Amino acid sequence: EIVTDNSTGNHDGYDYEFWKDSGGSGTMILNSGGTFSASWSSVSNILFRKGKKFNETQTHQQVGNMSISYGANFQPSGNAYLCVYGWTVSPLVEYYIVDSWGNWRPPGATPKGTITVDGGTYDIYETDRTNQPSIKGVATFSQYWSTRRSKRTSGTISVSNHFRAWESLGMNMGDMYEVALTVEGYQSSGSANVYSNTLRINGNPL
Numbered sequence: 001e002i003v004t005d006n007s008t009g010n011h012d013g014y015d016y017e018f019w020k021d022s023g024g025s026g027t028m029i030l031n032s033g034g035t036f037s038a039s040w041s042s043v044s045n046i047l048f049r050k051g052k053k054f055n056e057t058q059t060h061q062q063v064g065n066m067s068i069s070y071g072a073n074f075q076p077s078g079n080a081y082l083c084v085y086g087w088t089v090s091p092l093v094e095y096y097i098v099d100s101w102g103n104w105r106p107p108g109a110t111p112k113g114t115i116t117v118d119g120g121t122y123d124i125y126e127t128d129r130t131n132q133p134s135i136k137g138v139a140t141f142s143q144y145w146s147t148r149r150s151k152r153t154s155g156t157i158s159v160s161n162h163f164r165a166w167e168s169l170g171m172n173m174g175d176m177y178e179v180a181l182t183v184e185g186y187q188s189s190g191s192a193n194v195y196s197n198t199l200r201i202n203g204n205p206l
């Protein structure tokens with residue numbers, strides 16, 4: 001149902017998470033399957049997601065081929081991302097496949113390559129977080145990014161294609177912790193309605 005504070009659980013088969021740091025507010029409404037809506041106001045950082053959490057024992061290859069069909073009405077007022085998001089451990093990595101954004105195309109780095117997939121082209125980037133919040137407390141970890149060259153708010157995201165592309169460029173991943181269609185807000189406000197979000201693993205939906 002309605003979530004306005006940091007929370008992890010399972011709704012309609014999908015692992016959802018609400019996460020924000022202090023400042024401003026956010027509201028997440030959990031709808032059928034992987035669908036949810038999101039509103040935020042005067043946040044520093046906020047994340048809204050529904051996908052799949054893993055027990056950190058398998059590589060993406062061992063999990064299997066991952067793919068998400070999604071559609072969203074994406075209405076940010078400032079900096080925000082509509083993306084597939086998640087983590088690995090050993091190495092600890094925060095990752096992004098961004099299809100849309102607000103006023104700023106992330107991450108502000110030099111591309112390491114590109115991948116052409118799902119009817120578009122993405123620049124690939126690697127950045128570094130030093131002693132920042134993580135799924136494992138304050139930590140130092142890399143971020144991997146695929147960022148579409150033009151905004152899109154519905155389609156298929158061939159998640160594993162990006163994973164393979166990253167690893168080809170020497171951006172290696174560890175054991176899967178999570179994969180999830182995600183709305184992020186950074187020092188901004190806005191709203192979003194994810195009316196479609198289906199995660200398939202080996203062609204089988206959650």
Ligand SMILES: O[C@@H]1[C@@H](O)[C@H](O)OC[C@H]1O
Binds near residue numbers: 045106107186
């Ligand atoms: O990399 C940035 C991250 O550090 C911040 O917390 O949220 C916005 C991102 O672009």
